Each structure stands twice: as C-alpha cells, then as structure tokens.
Amino acid sequence: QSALTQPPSASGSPGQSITISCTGTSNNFVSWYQQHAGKAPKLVIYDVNKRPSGVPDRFSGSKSGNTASLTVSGLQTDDEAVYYCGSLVGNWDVIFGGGTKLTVLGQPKAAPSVTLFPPSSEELQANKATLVCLISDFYPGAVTVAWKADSSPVKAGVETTTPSKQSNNKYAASSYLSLTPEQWKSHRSYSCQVTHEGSTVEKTVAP
Amino acid sequence: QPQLQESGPTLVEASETLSLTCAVSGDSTAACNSFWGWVRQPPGKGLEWVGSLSHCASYWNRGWTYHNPSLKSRLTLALDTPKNLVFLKLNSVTAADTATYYCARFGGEVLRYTDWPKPAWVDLWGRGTLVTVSSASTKGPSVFPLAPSSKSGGTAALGCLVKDYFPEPVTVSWNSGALTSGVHTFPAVLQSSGLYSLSSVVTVPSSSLGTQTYICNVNHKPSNTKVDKRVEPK
Amino acid sequence: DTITLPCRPAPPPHCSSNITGLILTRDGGNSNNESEIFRTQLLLNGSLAEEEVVIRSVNFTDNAKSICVQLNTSVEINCTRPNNNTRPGEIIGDIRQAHCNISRAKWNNTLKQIASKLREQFGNNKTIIFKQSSGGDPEIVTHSFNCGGEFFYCDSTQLFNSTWF
Ligand SMILES: *[C@@H]1O[C@H](CO)[C@@H](O[C@@H]2O[C@H](CO)[C@@H](O[C@@H]3O[C@H](CO[C@H]4O[C@H](CO[C@H]5O[C@H](CO)[C@@H](O)[C@H](O)[C@@H]5O[C@H]5O[C@H](CO)[C@@H](O)[C@H](O)[C@@H]5O)[C@@H](O)[C@H](O[C@H]5O[C@H](CO)[C@@H](O)[C@H](O)[C@@H]5O)[C@@H]4O)[C@@H](O)[C@H](O[C@H]4O[C@H](CO)[C@@H](O)[C@H](O)[C@@H]4O[C@H]4O[C@H](CO)[C@@H](O)[C@H](O)[C@@H]4O[C@H]4O[C@H](CO)[C@@H](O)[C@H](O)[C@@H]4O)[C@@H]3O)[C@H](O)[C@H]2NC(C)=O)[C@H](O)[C@H]1NC(C)=O
Ligand SMILES: *[C@@H]1O[C@H](CO)[C@@H](O[C@@H]2O[C@H](CO)[C@@H](O[C@@H]3O[C@H](CO[C@H]4O[C@H](CO[C@H]5O[C@H](CO)[C@@H](O)[C@H](O)[C@@H]5O)[C@@H](O)[C@H](O[C@H]5O[C@H](CO)[C@@H](O)[C@H](O)[C@@H]5O)[C@@H]4O)[C@@H](O)[C@H](O[C@H]4O[C@H](CO)[C@@H](O)[C@H](O)[C@@H]4O)[C@@H]3O)[C@H](O)[C@H]2NC(C)=O)[C@H](O)[C@H]1NC(C)=O
C-alpha cells in the first residue's frame, strides 16, 4: 500500500559516513528508527533534526523539499541495523518507509558448504520422497538455491527458506524438495546448486 | 523507567479474534502529552501502524481514536486509564495477520494542538510478541534417519529428518547429551500445507562405524512425541 | 455554512447572546449613490421591535449624525476562547483562536430587512453599500461592547462586505 521511498540496502566501512534517503513526506513530522536484528525498534530522530535522550550527535536529521535524510557519521559495529523513516499524513494517519538495511563492512568474505541428503528406506515405505540441501558457514548472509534432475532444472516442490546467523558469526539456510518416488527412481542423478556472490557450489546424489 | 509490556495468546487460530494487552509502567495513560497504541511487523517485513487513542478530550468529544483505514473494519482500541492498560482486539484473522505486535507510545503535536491532535512518532516502544495465525491442527513429527557415506575428508556427516508436524518447536539431541563439539541443528520450514519441517546434522569419524551406532533424541510437547531412531549406512 | 468573526481576548468561554441592534454612521463622498458603515458598533441584550426592523435617526440629512437600527428578530451570537485551564499555568489542547459565530443566511435575512427599510427613508432607488469603518478610536474599527460583565473589542468586516439592490 502507501509507503515512504527508502532504498532497500546500504553499506559503509568503520569510520566512514552513510547518508540514507526517504521520499513522500510533505510536512515536518519526520522520524527515523533503528532496528537491531533480533530486537525491537528504537527512535533515533523526530521533528526532522531532533535527537532523543542519550542518542549520539553523529545521528543527524535533514529535509529538503519532499526528501528527508538521515546521516550516520563515523560508522561502527553497533550501527549495523535496519533504518526506517516515518511521517504524519493527511489528518492524523501515520506512515513508515520500507526501511534501508545498513551493513558495516570488514568481515572476511566466507564460502558456503553444502551437504545434500537423498531419502531414507523407511520414508519410501509411506509412498514419499524428499531431498534436503544443507547449506552453511557463509558471508554475507544472502544466498540463492537452484534444483536440477540429471541436467534439466526443477521448478516444482521447492520450499527455500530465509538464512539465519550461527554461533560462528556465519549464516545458514536449507531448501526442501518434496516429490513422488516415481519421478525419483526414473531420473538417475539429482543436482542441487547454491549460488553465493556470483560463484556457485554444486552437489549431486543417485541411487 | 518507562516500560511497555505486551501479553496474550502467542498462537491464535484462523478466522478467530486476536487479543493483546499492554501493561504501561513509568508513565500515566491519563496524561495529556501523548497517545497510546500499536504498530505490527510481519515476519521479515516493514513496520505497519495499527492505531492509537487518548481520553484527553475537548468541548466536542470524550477523547480521540485513530485507525489504519484497512485494519479499521477488524479492530477495537482501548484504554484503562487507572489500571494503566492498553488493549487491541483484531477479529477474523488470516495468516496475513501473523506479525510481531509492538506496544507503542505516540508523541508528536499532541498536548496543545489546533483543531485536532497530530501524534506522529513512536517515542517509547515495547519488546514485542509474535502471534502465529493458523488454519491447521496438531500433528506428530514423522522421524526418518538420514544415512551417510560408507567408504567426506576424514570425518563424514549424518542427520535426522523431522518431517510434517504442527505447531513449533522441536528438540533433537545426539546420544542424550553425549556429544557437544561438532554438533548442529537446522531451523524449521513452513510447508505449503500449513505444516512445519526441519532436520539436524552431526560430524563423526569413519573408524567408529560397526558395533558403535548413533541415535538422535526427538522431543515434541503438543502431539506428545518422544521417538528416537538409530542411524545405519548402506 | 456559518460565519466566524475573528476576536482577540477572553475571559468568558460562553456568552451565547442575541443581537438586538446596530450603530451606523455614513461618511462623505456621495458620487451617485450613498454608502454606509458601522461605528458602540452593535447592541446586545436590549429591547427588540414588535414587527419588522424599526429605523430612526437624529438627522437623516446630516452625514455626521448616528443612525439607530432596532431589529425585530434576535440574531444568535455564540462566542468562545480556549477553555482548558486544569494544568497550571499554560493552557492545554485546542488553541484555535478567539471567535464569535453567526449563521450565514440568518444575518443576510436580517440585513435585507434593514436594506428594504433603508430604501423608503431615501425615496427608494436602493443601492445600499456596506463598507468598513472610517476610524477615530480602536473601539470604532473593532466592535467594543459588553458580554458577561466584561468589555472586549474584536474585528468584524466579514459581517459588512455586501451590496444590496
Ligand atoms: C464556530 O464555528 C465553526 C464553523 O465556522 C465551528 O467549527 C466546526 O467545529 C466542529 C467541531 O467542533 C468540526 O467538526 C469536526 O470535524 C472533524 C474534522 O473534519 C475534517 O476531517 C474529516 C475527515 O477527513 C479525512 O477523512 C475522510 C474519510 O477518510 C476523507 O474524506 C477526508 O478527505 C480526510 O482524509 C484524509 O485523512 C484521512 C485520515 O487521516 C486519510 O485516511 C486520507 O487518506 C486523507 O489524507 C472530514 O470528514 C471533514 O469534512 C467535512 O467538512 C467539510 C468542511 O469544508 C465538508 O466540505 C465535507 O463535506 C465534510 O462534511 C473535515 O475536512 C471531524 O473528524 C469530526 O467528526 C468526528 O467526531 C465526531 C464526534 O461526535 C464523530 O461522531 C465523528 O464520527 C468523527 O469521528 C471520527 O474522527 C475523530 C476525530 O475527529 C476520531 O477521534 C474518531 O475516532 C472518528 O475517527 C474514525 O474516523 C476517522 C475519519 O473521520 C478516521 O480517520 C479514524 O481512523 C477513525 O476510524 C467533526 O465533524 C467542524 O469541522 C468545524 N468546522 C469549521 C469550518 O471549522 C466551531 O465549532 C464553532 N465554535 C464553537 C466554539 O462552537
Ligand atoms: C482538559 O485537560 C484535562 C487534562 O488536564 C483532560 O483531562 C483528562 O480527561 C480524561 C477524559 O475524562 C480523563 O480520563 C478519565 O479517567 C477516568 C479515571 O480517572 C481517575 O484516574 C486517573 C488515572 O488514575 C490515577 O491512579 C492510578 C492508580 O492505579 C495511576 O496508575 C494513574 O497514573 C493515575 O495517577 C486520574 O488521572 C484521574 O484524575 C483526574 O481527576 C481528579 C478528580 O477525580 C483530579 O483531581 C485530577 O487532577 C485529574 O484531573 C482520576 O483520579 C476514567 O474513568 C474515564 O473514563 C473512561 O470510561 C468511560 C466509560 O464510559 C469513558 O466515557 C471514558 O472515555 C473512559 O474510557 C476517563 O478515561 C483523564 O484522566 C483526565 N485527567 C488528566 C489529568 O489527564 C480533559 O479531558 C480536558 N478537557 C476538558 C475540557 O476538560
């Protein structure tokens, strides 16, 4: 529906300064929010330019024409969060942007590791067939998964899921392919492709 | 000092009425400077305004209530001035209403206003709680062991499959807390069938294979399931 | 739907009185047809006429003399200012402004009664013009009167910005 136009993502390294935009605010009832992943949102700015209590001076408000702008100067580890913008509208209604996803660089590029698994003897007894791709230990946390049958790609039974951060600072995800035992036995080999920052990693299983 | 506390059913059923209650502490709901309400956020989606109110009236009203036009039809906002409680009632819920509901304290052009009060920012927030809407009933998890290779890189990996079940969660331990190092467990998958599914994985050496076998320890409280399975390769 | 004349002070957040009459005084510069303005300015809680507006004057020929207007129908005048005083010392809630309310058609229907009676006192050929006051004192340009015991002045203009016949 109606939403404020905020860029999807943004990045900077420690020490650098990032400036993220917000369009659709004709008034001055403009606000910015900070959201830590696995946490609630904290207000960092209101009335365009004003900071709340115990909020550093490095967080700043601007508004030229229809565009509001937040500026994080001198980035640090604790700055990596999702930043939303918000404004009053019409009479008394309130809107929020899409939120910009901020990333603090300086985390070595990490390669994924896949562990595909074909179905079990007990599973086929109940007239079912499910193949599970087990991707782990990768940075950044943004991966794409593709499935194949010998050489031809598969479009049905795909149930890919959002990645999650592990105890070792890395990210992990798993795609679940559920089919019939008929299409599993006819097609000999089954390939599972996982694309990480252009480069892909492959795995395959055949009975 | 000022803290907003959310409470209610973490798992409401489809087409039923979702109810949540906030417990304000460190501020008075009677106070004329702000509005009180809610803001919802769907799993990995943007912040959505729900609505807000304040009993502080003028010569022509007995307070003020403001709603999100789309959610208007299905919602009721309430304020218990002395008991210091805020309320939300959302009737006829869909899986589209699954979100982390936050209790919000609205600031803006509230206290002294012209024509009407303009609340514009959530100054004080709550920790928030996840409500899960479902058109599905409780089912036990289908346990199948995942056999590894017989003949990668010195040490190979094996796991246990936790198929079709509802609701969450599940706990799988390898050999009843025997191994801690080189242990892993993967998160759930929301099925197209409104069901759930996950798995786990453990890395062990090849020399141990033979008279020494591996067993995963499954646990599910709602459907009452505690069936363990032995793993053997071919 | 209704008219709202701007006012400046307080202290009564009630009044809700009725208009009984009005003070008029014309100035020089006849050209072809006579123009009149208000100059005190309006009467409240007095003695209304029996049937239709009764108008008389000290000297009809003289421009310098005051002209009396005694209306038949009471014109409702609802006056207010920001009331909420519960929080010391600054006011809270709606600030709006100080204003007095009258109904658009109600005044216009009362004004046409004066207009028709103004035609016969000058041998018909009516072209009645309502313009702003000449001046002199700040109590002449801004309607200075009593309501609720106290005396307070506030601008009209919106009330006398029409030309009839
Ligand atoms: C001296 O004389 C003076 C006159 O000369 C006199 O002044 C008059 O005073 C009275 C009060 O004393 C005034 O009357 C009030 O006016 C309020 C505001 O009115 C304006 O706004 C509304 C709503 O506008 C938005 O919404 C509608 C519907 O969606 C749209 O059609 C609009 O375009 C607009 O939309 C924008 O905003 C939306 C919400 O943010 C967005 O979703 C949207 O995208 C848009 O951005 C209009 O309806 C009004 O229009 C009317 O008047 C104009 C005049 O030119 C006409 O042309 C037109 O045809 C209309 O008739 C106007 O623009 C009213 O809200 C208020 O009514 C409420 O209160 C009564 C209480 O008894 C309720 O019964 C009633 O149901 C209303 O309740 C709702 O609103 C209140 C807040 O006001 C909420 O707290 C309440 O919960 C309820 O909200 C629900 O509905 C909301 C929508 O209404 C919704 O947003 C909420 O989410 C919620 O679910 C009342 O009528 C009057 O206007 C003054 N007039 C003047 C000229 O000054 C003065 O009193 C005299 N002095 C003294 C001392 O006596
Ligand atoms: C002018 O501005 C004033 C503000 O200065 C504004 O006043 C507010 O008006 C609303 C609307 O009526 C009031 O809200 C009502 O509250 C009723 C209960 O009132 C009592 O409790 C209040 C809170 O409890 C105290 O104690 C608890 C203990 O547990 C504590 O936690 C709280 O923090 C708090 O301290 C209390 O504030 C209130 O006190 C006021 O009145 C006393 C005298 O009684 C006075 O001495 C104080 O100075 C103070 O003004 C009181 O003790 C509640 O019942 C009521 O109604 C609800 O139910 C009915 C059901 O039909 C509904 O009609 C209604 O909409 C509500 O749902 C209502 O919510 C608010 O408390 C006012 N007071 C303040 C200070 O903000 C005016 O409205 C403005 N307008 C005008 C022109 O007057």
Identify whether residues B126 and B10 lie together within a single domain. yes
Distances (CA, A) of C131 to C38, C135, C143: 8, 12, 15
Identity of the residue numbered A198? G
Query: What is the least distance, in Å, from the CA of B127 to any CA of chain A?
Result: 6
Whether B180 and B105 map to the same domain: the answer is: no
Check whether residue B183 and residue B216 sit in a common domain: yes
Domain ranges in chain C?
A: 1-165
Return left, alpha or beta for A47; rule: phi > 0 is left, psi -120 to 50 is alpha, else beta.
left
Residue type at position B194: G
Residue B199 structure tokens: 């798995």
- E strand or H helix at C163, and its extent? strand C163-164
What is the amino acid identity at position C135?
G
One domain for residues B113 and B64: yes
Ligand nearest to the CA of B70: 1
Distance B105 CA to ligand 1 centre (A): 24
Beta strands in chain B (DSSP E): 3-7, 18-25, 35-41, 48-54, 64-67, 75-80, 85-90, 99-109, 118-124, 129-131, 143-146, 155-165, 173-174, 183-185, 189-190, 196-205, 214-217, 229-231
Give the position, in ligand 2's atom list, of the atom nearest the Cα of B32.
Answer: 76
C94 contacts B111? CB cut-off 8 A:
no
Please indicate whether, in this complex, the C-beta atoms of A120 and B161 are within 8 angstroms of each other.
yes
Token look-up 């006011």 returns: C91
Experimental method: X-ray
Residues B69 and B128 in one domain: yes
Task: From chain B, pick out residues whose CB is under 8 angstroms from the CB of C16.
Answer: none
Spatial separation of the C-alpha atoms in residues C71 and C15, rounded to whole Å: 20
Two tokens, residue C60:
């009809």
Count of H-run helices and E-run strands, chain C: 2, 11
Whether chain C has a CB inside 8 Å of the CB on B60: the answer is: no
Bridge-partner residues for A27, per DSSP? none
Nearest CA in chain B to C92: B112
Check if B69 has its Cβ closer than 6 Å to any atom of ligand 1. yes
Residue B67 CA: nearest ligand 1 atom is 98
Q: Which chains lie within 8 Å of chain C at 3 or more CB pairs, if any? A: B
CA-nearest of B84, C37, B47, B155 to A115 is B155
CA of B61 from ligand 2 middle (Å) equals 14
Distance, CA B30 to ligand 2 centroid (Å)?
5
Distance B53 CA to ligand 1 centre (A): 16
Q: Any idea which ligand is nearest the CA of C87?
A: 2
Same domain, B84 and B159: no
CATH value at residue B171: 2.60.40.10
Give the closest-approach CA distance of B21 to chain C in angstroms.
28
Task: Please give the tally of structural domains in chain B.
Answer: 2
* Residues of chain C contacting B111 with CB distance shorter than 8 Å: 92-93
B19 and B108 within one domain: yes
Token digits for B163?
């198929």
> Read out DSSP for C123-144?
TS---EEEE----SSHHHHTEE
What resolution in angstrom units was achieved for this structure?
A: 3.2
Scanning the structure block, which residue is given the tokens 């950044």?
A140
Q: Give the residue among B21, B135, B143, B138 at the shortest CA–CA distance from B76.
A: B21
Interface test with B, best of C14, C85, C92, C96 (most B CBs within 10 A): C92
Cα separation of the two ends of chain A: 49
Q: Are chains C and A in touch, 3+ Cβ pairs below 8 Å?
A: no
Distance CA C138, CA C152 (A): 11
**Beta carbons of A10 and A100 less than 8 angstroms apart:** yes
Which residue of B lies nearest to A156 if distances are taken between CA atoms? Answer: B192
Q: How far is the CA of B60 from the centre of ligand 1 (A)?
A: 11
- Name the E strands within chain A: 9-12, 17-23, 30-35, 41-45, 59-64, 67-73, 82-89, 93-96, 100-104, 129-138, 144-149, 152-154, 158-159, 164-165, 171-179, 190-196, 199-205
Q: How is chain A split among helix, strand and coil, in percent rounded to 5? A: 5, 50, 40
Structural domain for B173, as ranges? 136-234
Contact A134 B201 (CB under 8 A): yes
Amino acid at C71: L
The ligand 1 atom at the shortest distance from the C-alpha of residue C3 is: 5
Is A132's CB within 8 Å of B146's CB? yes
Taking only Cα atoms into account, the Rg of chain A, rounded to an integer number of angstroms, comes to 23
**B117 and B11 fall within a common domain:** yes
Which of B117, B135, B153 represents a domain boundary (last residue)?
B135
CA distance A158 to C1: 63
CB neighbours of residue A170 within 10 Å: 19
Judgement on whether residues B111 and B183 belong to the same structural domain of the protein: no
- φ/ψ region of A51 (left if φ > 0, alpha if ψ in -120 to 50, else beta) reads beta
Domain endpoint, select from B135, B166, B186: B135
CA atoms of B107 and B54, how far apart (whole Å): 11
Residue B108: closest CA among chain A residues belongs to which residue? Answer: A29
Q: In C, residues 18-37, which contact B (CB 8 Å cutoff)? A: none
Assess whether B127 and B199 both reside in one domain.
no
Q: How far is the CA of C108 from the centre of ligand 2 (A)?
A: 44
B neighbours by CB contacts (3+ pairs under 8 Å)? A, C
CA–CA separation, C91 vs C95, rounded Å?
8
The three-state secondary structure class of C73 is: strand
Q: Which domains does chain A have, with CATH numbers?
A: 2-106 (2.60.40.10), 107-207 (2.60.40.10)
- Decide: B60 in ligand 1 pocket, CB within 6 A: yes
B95, B198: one domain: no
CA-nearest of B128, B109, B105, B111 to B119 is B109
From B68, B101, B135, give the residue that closes a domain.
B135
Q: Is the dihedral of CA B71, A7, B100, B6 positive or negative?
A: negative
Rounded-to-integer distance, Cα B93 and Cα B14, Å: 6
Residue B127 and residue B157 share a domain: no
Substitution target from A5, A34, A91, A92 for chain B, most B beta carbons within 10 A: A92
How far is the first Cα of chain B from the last one, in angstroms, to the nearest whole number?
62
For tokens 């959302």, name the residue. Answer: B90
Q: Which residue in chain B has the smallest CA separation from C83?
A: B59
